[PDB]
């Protein structure tokens, strides 16, 4: 018999992004080919199968720095980190291959699906 | 020119609630009249003007235990903590006064608004 506030989840995510932009309570640095990205471990886990596996590990859950595979493109990661905190994906002809490869590595199934569909339309 | 995934914010919140239910990466205990509630500081800040003020304070941001005012009802807090992680509010005739008072103290404007409206309909 609950009532539901339609905009609550969107408002929560908007506030989490405001905390990220002001670097408030960020607890991890993600290193991608020398580029560094500060974030909240919980948000990373909520969006990515890879981060979920990493931060539920009894040893890795305590790390303040995570280094990604050197094949990962920093721009592709930045676009996906922005998507995690906003639901908006900046998908372009010039970045789609790097975004899809990064989303496959991060295990972000819905992003992988839209990249596959956008690539299939161009062939 | 971004594309947007409609269900992303809801899916993020659902995963944050799954982490709460398994006590994963919870970083604070909220004490309400001897009852204890584990939560994520970022989620509390994203939902409540009071927690936002508390955890942006340079001294309080580092506390692992927060004690609420003794007038706060533990059931009212539990209902609001559930709302924070699900967007669902268990509002009933028997709890509405305690829920409204707790939401006013926590500074959760949309909850206060629906409580005022439900109370006004009953008079």
């Amino acid at each position: 018999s609950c009532i539901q506030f339609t905009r609550h989840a969107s408002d929560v995510l908007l506030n989490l992004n405001r905390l990220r932009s002001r670097d408030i309570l960020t607890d991890v640095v993600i290193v991608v080919s020398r580029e560094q990205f500060r974030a909240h471990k919980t948000v990373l886990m909520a969006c990515s199968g890879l981060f979920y596996s990493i931060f539920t590990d009894q040893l890795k859950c305590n790390l303040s720095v995570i280094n990604l595979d050197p094949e990962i493109n920093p721009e592709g990661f930045c676009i996906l980190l922005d998507f995690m905190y906003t639901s908006r994906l900046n998908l372009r002809e010039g970045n789609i291959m790097a975004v899809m490869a990064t989303a496959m590595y991060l295990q972000m199934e819905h992003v992988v699906d839209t990249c596959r569909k956008f690539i299939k339309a161009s062939e | 020119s971004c594309i947007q995934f409609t269900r992303h914010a809801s899916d993020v919140l659902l995963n944050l609630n799954r982490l709460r239910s398994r006590d994963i990466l919870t970083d604070v205990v909220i004490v309400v009249s001897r009852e204890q509630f584990r939560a994520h500081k970022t989620v509390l800040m994203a939902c409540s003007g009071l927690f936002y003020s508390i955890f942006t304070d340079q001294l309080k941001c580092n506390l692992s235990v927060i004690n609420l005012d003794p007038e706060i009802n533990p059931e009212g807090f539990c209902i609001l903590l559930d709302f924070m992680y699900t967007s669902r509010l268990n509002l009933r005739e028997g709890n509405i006064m305690a829920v409204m008072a707790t939401a006013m103290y926590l500074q959760m404007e949309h909850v206060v608004d629906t409580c005022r409206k439900f109370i006004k309909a009953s008079e």
Partner: peptide, 4 residues
């Protein structure tokens, strides 16, 4: 607010 809605009935979910």
């Amino acid at each position: 607010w809605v009935i979910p």
